[PDB]
């Protein structure tokens, strides 16, 4: 009855004047990279040693 497309779209973080939305991992980019590259460095320091 509504005479419209039977789809409902909701954004997570809206993009200004844009139908689709921007997710969470867009701002979280390179933070995971740095944190992983430091944790891997710490694990490298511990494991590549002589205990």
């Amino acid at each position: 009855p509504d005479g419209k497309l039977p789809f409902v779209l909701v954004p997570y973080m809206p993009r200004k004047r844009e139908l689709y939305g921007e997710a969470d991992a867009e701002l979280l980019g390179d933070n995971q990279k740095i944190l992983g590259a430091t944790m891997r460095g710490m694990i490298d320091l511990l494991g590549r040693s002589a205990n």
């Binding site: 390179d30 990279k33 740095i34 992983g36 590259a37 891997r40």
Partner: peptide, 8 residues
């Protein structure tokens, strides 16, 4: 070596 080990 820098780019290969990750480190974006």
């Amino acid at each position: 070596l820098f780019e290969k080990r990750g480190w974006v």
